[PDB]
Structures are given as C-alpha cells and as structure tokens.
From Swiss-Prot, chains A, B, C, D, E, F, G, H, I, J, K, L:
The chain holds residues 15 to 97 of 140 of the full protein. Neuronal protein that plays several roles in synaptic activity such as regulation of synaptic vesicle trafficking and subsequent neurotransmitter release. Participates as a monomer in synaptic vesicle exocytosis by enhancing vesicle priming, fusion and dilation of exocytotic fusion pores. Mechanistically, acts by increasing local Ca(2+) release from microdomains which is essential for the enhancement of ATP-induced exocytosis. Cu cation binds at H25. Keywords: Acetylation, Alzheimer disease, Amyloid, Cell projection, Copper, Cytoplasm, Disease variant, Membrane, Metal-binding, Neurodegeneration, Nucleus, Parkinson disease, Parkinsonism, Phosphoprotein, Repeat, Secreted, Synapse, Ubl conjugation. This is Alpha-synuclein.
Length: 72, 72, 72, 72, 72, 72, 72, 72, 72, 72, 72, 72
C-alpha cells in the first residue's frame, strides 16, 4: 500500500465544455419506501459530462489503491 | 499506507465551461419513507459537469489510498 | 499513514466558468419520514460544476489517505 | 499519521466565475419527520460551483489523512 | 498526528467572482418535527460558489489530519 | 498532535467579489418542533461565496488537526 | 365595403396548452442588405401562443375592414 | 366603408396555458443595412401569450376599420 | 368611414397563465445602418402576456378607426 | 369618420398570471446609425403584462379615432 | 370626426398577477447616432403591468380622438 | 372633432399585483448623438404598475381630444 517516486536531475492543454441543462450524479443512492440499501463505494470514481484527464503523470509519478471487504 | 516522493536537482492550461441550469450531486442519499439506508463511501470520488484533471503529477509526486470494511 | 516529500536543490493556468441557475450538493442526505439513514463518508470527495485540479503536484509532493470500518 | 516535508537550497493563475442564482450545499442533512439520521463525515470534502485547486503542491509539500469507525 | 516542515537556505494569482442571489450552506442540519438527528462532522470541509485553493503549499509545507469514532 | 516548522537562512494576490443578495450559513442547525438534534462539529470548516485560500504555506509551515468521539 | 348584421325578437369548455420552448412569429419581414421596405397592415392580426376567441357576436356585429395601396 | 349592427326586442369555461421560455413576435420588420423603412398600422393588432376574447358584442357592435396609402 | 350600433327594448370563467422567461414584442421595427424610418399607428394595438377582453359591448358600441398616408 | 351608438328602453370570473422574467415591448423602433425617425401614434395602444378589459360599454360608447399623415 | 352615444329610459371578479423581474416598455424609440427624431402622440396610450379597465361607460361616453401631421 | 353623450330618465371586485423588480416605461425616446428631438403629447397617457380604471362614465362623459402638427 506503498507508493514511491523519485526524480533526480544532474504545450497547450485545452478543455472546452458548453453544456445546457446538464445534470450530473456521482455516487448516489436514490430510493423510496425501500426496506434497506447497502452501498460500500471505496475505490476511485470519476464521473462527469466533460471528464478529462490530460497528462495524469508527467515526471516520476506513482499512484496506488487498496480496498477490502470481510463480512464473516 | 506510506507515500514518499523525493526530487533532487544538482505551457497554457485552459479549462472553459459555459453551463446553463446545471445541477450536480456528489455523494448523495435521497430517500423517502425508507426504513434504512447504509452508505459507507470511503474512497476517492471526483464528480462534476466539467471535471478536468490536467497535470496531476509533474515532478516527483506520489498518491496513495487505503480503505477497509470488517463486519464479522 | 506516513507521507513524506523532500526536495533538495544544489505558464498560465486558466479556469473559466459562466454558470446560470447552478445548484451543487456535496455530501448530502435528503429524506422525509425515513426511519433511519446511515452515512459514513470518510474518504476524499471533490464535487462541482467546474471541478478543475491543475498541477496537483509540481515539485516533491506526497498525498496519502486511510479509512476504516469495524462493526463486529 | 505523520507528514513531513523538508526543502533545502544551497506564471498567472486565473480563476473566473460569473454565476447567477447559485445555490451550494456542503455536508447537509435535510429531513422532515424522520425518526433518526446518522451522519459521520470525517474525511475531506471540497464542494462548489467553481471548485479549482491549482498548484496544490509546488515545493516540498506533504498531505495526510486518517479516519476510523468502530462500533462493536 | 505529527506534522513537520523545515526549510533551510544557504506571479499573479487572480480569483474573480460576480454572483447574483447566491446562497451557500456549509455543514447544515435542516429539519422539522424530526425525533432526532446525529451529525459528527470532524474532518475538513471546504464549501463555496467560488472555492479556489491556489498554491496550497509553496515551500516546505506539511498538512495532517486525524479523526475517530468509537461507540462500543 | 505536534506541529513544528523551522526555517534557517544563512507577486499580486487578487480576490474580487461582487455579490448581490448573498446569504451564507456556516455550521447551522435549523429546526422546528424537533424532539432533539445532536451536532458535534469539531474539525475544520471553511464556507463562503468567495472562499479563496491563496498561498496557504509559503515558507516553513505546518498545520495539524485531531478530533475524537467516544460514547461507550 | 358594405357590411351589416341584424337580429330581431318579439356547457363544460376547456382549452389547454403546455408548451415548452415555443417561439411564435406573426407577420415577419426578415431580410439582409436591402434598400426599400414597406409594411402596411390594415385588417385584423392576432398572434400569440393560445389565441382563443369564444362565443363572439351574440347579437349583431360587423368586423368590416378596408385597405388600399396606390403606388405611382 | 359602411358597417352596421342592430338588435331589437319587444357555463363552466377554462382557458389555461403553462408556457416555458416562450418568445412571441407580432408585426416585425427585422433587417440589416437598409435605407428606407415604412411601417403603417391601421387595423387591429392583438399580440401576447394568451390572447383571449370571450363573449364579445352581446348587443350591437362595429369593429369597422379603414386604411389607405398613397405614394407618388 | 361610417359605423353604427343600436339596441332597443320595450357562469364560472377562468383564464390562467404560468409563463416563465416570456419575451413578447408587439409592433417592432428592428434595423441596423438605415437612413429613413417612419412608424405610423392609427388603429388599436393590444400587447401583453395575458391580453384578455371579456363581455365587451353589452349595449351599442363603435370601435371605428380611420387612417391615411400621403407621400409625394 | 362617423361613429354612433344608441340604447333605448321603455358570475364567477378569474384572470390570473404568474410570470417570471417577463419582458414586454409595445410599439418599438430599435435602430442603429440612422438619420430620420418619425413615430406618430393616434389610435389606442394598450401595453402591459395583464392587459384586461372587462364588461366595457354597458350602454352607448364610441371608441372612434382618426389619423392622418401628409408628406410633401 | 363625429362620435356619439345615447341612452334613454322611461358578481365575483378577480384579476391577479405575480410578476418577478418584469420589464415593460410602451411606445419606445431606441436609436444610436441619428439626426432627426419626432414623436407625436395624440390618441390614448395605457402602459403598465396590470392595465385593467372594468365596467366602463355605463351610460353614454365618447372616446373620440383626432390627430394630424403635415410635413412640407 | 365633435363628441357627445346623453342619458335621460323619466359586487365583489379585486385587482391585485405582487411585482418584484418591475421597471416600467411609458412614452420613451432613448437616443445617442442626435441633433433634433421633438416630443408632442396631446391625448391621454396613463403609465404605472397597476393602472386601473373602474366604472367610469356612469352618466354622460366626453373623452374627446384633438392634436395637430404643422411643419414647413
């Protein structure tokens, strides 16, 4: 669950959105008269009309993730 | 659950949004007359009409995450 | 749950939003006559019509996170 | 739960918002005649119509987080 | 729960907002005739129509956080 | 719960707001005829129409936080 | 232009409309790069979205209209 | 232009409209780069969204109208 | 232009409108870069959103109108 | 221009409007870069949002109107 | 311009309006960079938001109006 | 310009308005960079927000109006 990144040294990024009457829901639990609902979102969620990820890593870059579920 | 980043040394980023009547919900629990709802959001949630992540890491950069669930 | 970043040494960022009648909800629990609702948001939530993260790390930068849930 | 950052030495950031009739709710619990609601927000929540995070770290910078839940 | 930052040595930041009839709620508990509501906000909440965080760290800078919940 | 920052040595920041009929609520508990409400806000809450945090740390700077809840 | 009317002696109604984004034009003269434009109206022009005329002229009525145009 | 009317002796109604974003134009002369424009009105022009005329002229009425135009 | 009327002797009503963002124009002369503009009105012009005329002319009424235009 | 009226002898009503952001124009002459503009009105012009005329002319009434225009 | 009226012998009403941000113009002459402007009014002009005329002319009434315009 | 009226012998009402931010213009001459402006009024002009006329002319009344304009 260890992320490391070491860097040793010895353009135009455009995003354009023109939205009319936009509706966005992320992690959502919509219900009515339900007895129960279980939601265990624990990861990584990216949601959107214009969801852009330009140059996520450029130099030395590290990403990590870890999830679990034990019920017994 | 350890993140490290060491750096040793010896452009135009544009985002444009023109939204009309926009509605955005993140982590939301909408209900009516429900007996119970369980929501255990614990990760990483990015939500939006113009969700842009430009140059998330540029130099030495580290990201980490960790979630869990034990009920027994 | 340790984050470290050491740095040793020996452009234009534009975000534009023109929103009309915008509505934004973060972590929200909307209900009516519900017996119970459980919400345990404990991670990292970024929500918005213009959600922009430009140059999250530039030099030596470290991010970390940790969540848990034990009920027994 | 330890964050450290040591630095040893031996542009234009623009955000523009023009909003009309904007409504923003952060961590909110809206209810009516509900018997009970439980909300345990304890992480990191960033919510807004123009939610911009430019140059979150530039030099040696460290961020950390830690949450928990034990009910038994 | 320890944060340290040591630094040894041997541009224009613009935010513009033009809002009309804006409404902002932070951590809010709105109710009517409800028997009980429990809210335990203890993390870090940033909420707003123009929520901008430019150059959160520039030199040696450290941020830390810690939350907990035990009910038994 | 210890924060330290030692520094040894051997631009224009603009925020502009033009708001009309603005309403801002921080940590608020609005109710009517409710039997009970429990609010235990103890973290860090930043709320506002123009919520700007420019150059949160520049030199050696440390921030720390700590919250808890035990009910037994 | 002779018109006449004469009269001698000796229920549930509903009109409904639900129109979204309705653009209506009556008498229109749309042009570009002209020299002469003449618009003469001399009768009876009714424009709208719900142009309703109910139970007109119970007795005697004259809607008579005369127009002319001389061009030399 | 002779008009006449004469009269000698010896229920549930509903008009409804629900219009969103309704643009209405009556007599219109839209042009660009012209020299001469003439607009003569001499009759009866009714414009609106709900232009309703109910039970007119119970007895004797004259709507008579005369127009002319001489151009030499 | 002779008009006349004469009369000798010897219920539930509802008009409703719910209009949002309604732009209404009556007699309009929109132009750019002109020399001459003439606008003569001599009849009866009714403009609005809810232009309603109910039970007019119970007895004798004359709406007679005459116009002219001489151009040499 | 002769008009006349004569008369010899020997219920629940509702008009409603709920208009938001309603822009209304009657007789309008919108122009740019002109030389001559003439606006002659000589009849009967009614403008508004709720232009209502109810039960007019119970007895004898004359709405007679005459206009002229001479141009040499 | 002869008008006449004569008369010889021998209920629940409601008008309502709820208007928000309502801009109303009657007779308007909007222009830029002109030389000559003439505005002659000689009839009957009624402007407003709720222009209501109820039960006019119970007996004998004359609304007669005459206008002229000579240009040499 | 002859007008006349003559008369010989031998209920619940409500007008309501709730207007917010209401701008009303009657006879208007808006211009820029002109030389000549003439504004002649000779009839009957009624302007306002709630322009109401109720039960006028019970007996005999004359609203007669005459105007002229000579230009050489």
């Amino acid at each position: 669950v260890v992320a490391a990144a070491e860097k040793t040294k010895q353009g135009v990024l455009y995003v354009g959105s023109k939205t009319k009457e936009g509706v966005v829901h992320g992690v959502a639990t919509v219900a009515e008269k339900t007895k129960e609902q279980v939601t265990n979102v624990g990861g990584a969620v990216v949601t959107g009309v214009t969801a852009v990820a330009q140059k996520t890593v450029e130099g030395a870059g590290s990403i990590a993730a870890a999830t679990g579920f034990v019920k017994k």
